[PDB]
């Protein structure tokens, strides 16, 4: 088999460091070799060199080679998949509208690089914040690609929710089922427990029937909402290993398909005729599975109660608003 | 199966951070669950809490549980294997003798903790430097354990050597064979290419019959000998992902066996019957394989030419000297009490 070419942007950063090694260890593509494309910006070149030296020093049998560069063409040329980790951070005194705007330029350019140089089959996983909107913008500016080529990462939030709920219930994570993260990141993200069940002492029950209302519809979302901050406070730096784990998990599912019964939250271009009443035109986290051909599908059969309907409508509205901010910013530049 | 209990010392550091996640992901023990004992010192506990929050946030199916602690009993109780990453760093102005000395105390204490609380079957992989001597000291002070419970990590150096030689020859690492790292770490380490073969375009040859003498017996060791320093130069911090990869690799081989034809350099208590003329009484890197029962064996049949004999003898002498320094330091402290 020919090596799979895998792009990681922001490669010199903490996520890039772990992600590149984990992929080079064989965990993503199985027996197939990987050829890493490692992109970062000019001031990061020494850290990038250091990364390459440690990759070399692992003598990884799955590593066919690597590009380590500041050059977009070399980074994007003939790639099979991409982890778009890099993004513009919020600068002091800026608000979310600024974050969306500054990143819209980056992701327009990235969409252009993808279309121009990547394989038409490239699977692009958008991680850098604001991910849903960055993904929409890249897709809109990738002329020779299609919606199937794009998704955004919501699995970190899903995994956080599963551990929180399992710990609250005093059961194993494997014994909790059908927790879903819908919509956007940020304030409007829907951490949905209304489908969720758990097993214990031979009984399967709904989480919402056992846990306190005050926990489910207040305390729980605050915990999920402040988790990253809490880690930053303790660590001195933002999360790295846990988003990396989720990123590989998402991409591996996207490459080979999901397991029987598995439901993975994934941000995708909204499918026309999805069963949950979401309007096409944004990238929206849905409960998904992936078939053996590597195609993502929204999982059918979940229920939308009044609470969930309102939450879904609110995050939908939020996504269309972010998109309008991004596109208006780009249009003003034109 | 009951979960395997795995100790990582210095767990809040970068190695512990990556190692804990890699192990929790299922890479070490396969389908079996793991329970992580994560030991560090009080000032590091907030960083350790951050680590455990990230472990939680991975929702790892293989992770049965964990304890983050500063307490030796909680850390060592009933463990199945240990990654001894923590060590005392070199202080400004110190020389290697002082590094050996400061660590002798730590590793005496650690050997005592292992003997007191770990399972009799515990596999202890010593990583923190100076690792061969730290390993010998821990073993000497682990009264209820045996030489078979202890080894030290030389696979980072082996992996460096494979990549360097493969790149020099313009082949893949899989097409190079029988590179060995013998003896101690530090200046006396023996990066041996005299056994090595490589296959290129269906032709198999000895590496030393193709590469220049100047490369093999000068340039090559200079690159391998200074590599750690060069990554610190570029990274601003010591290596982390690469020793972690080597550590998992060593422990996984030690637990479940090596593959056909596979030869892994491993620091082990010198076996009395070894075929390479090394004296018992230190921990020495040898070319090893591991059987399906998890027993390490020195690989027989390698050749010791005059060059290699001299290198082996020098690193042997070096190891006995480090041991003397460590035991003397401990003795002087006891005397002072």
Short mmCIF file of C-alpha atoms in Angstrom, two decimals, chain A residues 14 17-18 21-22 25 33 46-47 49-50 52-61 63-66 155-156 158-160 162-163 172-174 227 230-231 233-243 245-246 249, chain B residues 14 17-18 21-22 25 33 45-50 52-61 63-66 155-156 158-160 162-163 172-174 223 227 230-231 234-235 238-243 245-246 249:
data_model
loop_
_atom_site.label_atom_id
_atom_site.label_comp_id
_atom_site.label_asym_id
_atom_site.label_seq_id
_atom_site.Cartn_x
_atom_site.Cartn_y
_atom_site.Cartn_z
CA UNK A 14 1.35 20.75 22.33
CA UNK A 17 3.52 17.13 19.38
CA UNK A 18 1.37 14.34 20.82
CA UNK A 21 3.69 10.73 17.58
CA UNK A 22 0.37 8.93 18.19
CA UNK A 25 2.86 4.90 16.14
CA UNK A 33 2.40 3.73 6.66
CA UNK A 46 12.90 25.50 15.87
CA UNK A 47 10.17 23.74 17.89
CA UNK A 49 12.67 20.85 14.09
CA UNK A 50 12.71 19.52 17.65
CA UNK A 52 10.99 16.01 13.85
CA UNK A 53 14.06 14.95 15.83
CA UNK A 54 11.95 13.10 18.40
CA UNK A 55 9.83 11.48 15.69
CA UNK A 56 13.06 10.21 14.12
CA UNK A 57 14.26 9.00 17.51
CA UNK A 58 11.26 6.68 17.84
CA UNK A 59 12.27 4.57 14.81
CA UNK A 60 8.59 4.17 14.02
CA UNK A 61 7.97 1.39 11.47
CA UNK A 63 6.52 6.42 9.50
CA UNK A 64 7.28 6.56 5.80
CA UNK A 65 8.61 10.09 6.03
CA UNK A 66 7.63 13.66 6.75
CA UNK A 155 -15.88 14.28 20.67
CA UNK A 156 -13.83 15.90 23.44
CA UNK A 158 -18.82 13.96 24.43
CA UNK A 159 -16.05 12.13 26.29
CA UNK A 160 -16.09 14.76 29.06
CA UNK A 162 -19.63 10.49 29.61
CA UNK A 163 -17.05 10.53 32.40
CA UNK A 172 -18.43 2.55 34.48
CA UNK A 173 -18.35 4.66 31.32
CA UNK A 174 -19.18 1.52 29.30
CA UNK A 227 -13.93 22.02 32.50
CA UNK A 230 -10.37 24.27 35.40
CA UNK A 231 -7.68 22.26 33.61
CA UNK A 233 -5.90 26.66 36.04
CA UNK A 234 -4.29 23.43 37.32
CA UNK A 235 -2.00 22.63 34.35
CA UNK A 236 -0.66 26.07 33.46
CA UNK A 237 -1.62 25.31 29.85
CA UNK A 238 -4.72 24.27 27.90
CA UNK A 239 -5.70 20.64 27.32
CA UNK A 240 -3.60 18.65 24.82
CA UNK A 241 -3.69 14.89 25.39
CA UNK A 242 -7.48 14.78 25.71
CA UNK A 243 -8.31 16.72 22.53
CA UNK A 245 -7.35 11.41 21.92
CA UNK A 246 -10.71 12.70 20.65
CA UNK A 249 -10.90 8.79 17.68
CA UNK B 14 5.84 15.55 30.51
CA UNK B 17 1.60 12.99 31.00
CA UNK B 18 2.12 11.18 27.71
CA UNK B 21 -2.49 8.53 28.37
CA UNK B 22 -0.74 6.05 26.09
CA UNK B 25 -5.48 4.02 25.67
CA UNK B 33 -7.81 -2.86 31.93
CA UNK B 45 0.00 17.90 42.80
CA UNK B 46 -1.98 20.60 40.99
CA UNK B 47 -0.31 19.57 37.71
CA UNK B 48 -1.05 15.97 38.60
CA UNK B 49 -4.71 16.83 39.19
CA UNK B 50 -4.75 18.45 35.73
CA UNK B 52 -6.04 13.11 35.90
CA UNK B 53 -8.77 15.48 34.68
CA UNK B 54 -7.53 14.93 31.12
CA UNK B 55 -7.40 11.16 31.63
CA UNK B 56 -11.02 11.35 32.80
CA UNK B 57 -11.93 13.48 29.79
CA UNK B 58 -10.75 10.76 27.40
CA UNK B 59 -13.41 8.30 28.64
CA UNK B 60 -10.90 5.48 28.14
CA UNK B 61 -12.57 2.04 28.19
CA UNK B 63 -8.93 2.75 32.37
CA UNK B 64 -10.33 0.97 35.44
CA UNK B 65 -9.25 3.80 37.70
CA UNK B 66 -6.31 5.71 39.13
CA UNK B 155 15.84 1.45 23.87
CA UNK B 156 15.76 5.23 23.26
CA UNK B 158 18.80 1.93 20.15
CA UNK B 159 15.93 3.63 18.33
CA UNK B 160 18.07 6.74 17.70
CA UNK B 162 18.44 2.63 13.96
CA UNK B 163 16.97 5.78 12.46
CA UNK B 172 13.82 1.90 6.00
CA UNK B 173 14.45 1.05 9.66
CA UNK B 174 12.83 -2.37 9.09
CA UNK B 223 25.63 12.04 16.90
CA UNK B 227 21.45 13.71 20.68
CA UNK B 230 20.52 18.69 20.73
CA UNK B 231 16.80 18.17 21.32
CA UNK B 234 15.74 23.07 19.97
CA UNK B 235 12.86 22.09 22.31
CA UNK B 238 14.31 17.44 27.47
CA UNK B 239 12.84 14.72 25.25
CA UNK B 240 9.48 13.33 26.34
CA UNK B 241 7.52 11.61 23.55
CA UNK B 242 10.57 9.62 22.38
CA UNK B 243 11.64 8.17 25.74
CA UNK B 245 7.74 5.48 23.15
CA UNK B 246 10.88 3.51 24.11
CA UNK B 249 8.11 -0.56 23.92
#
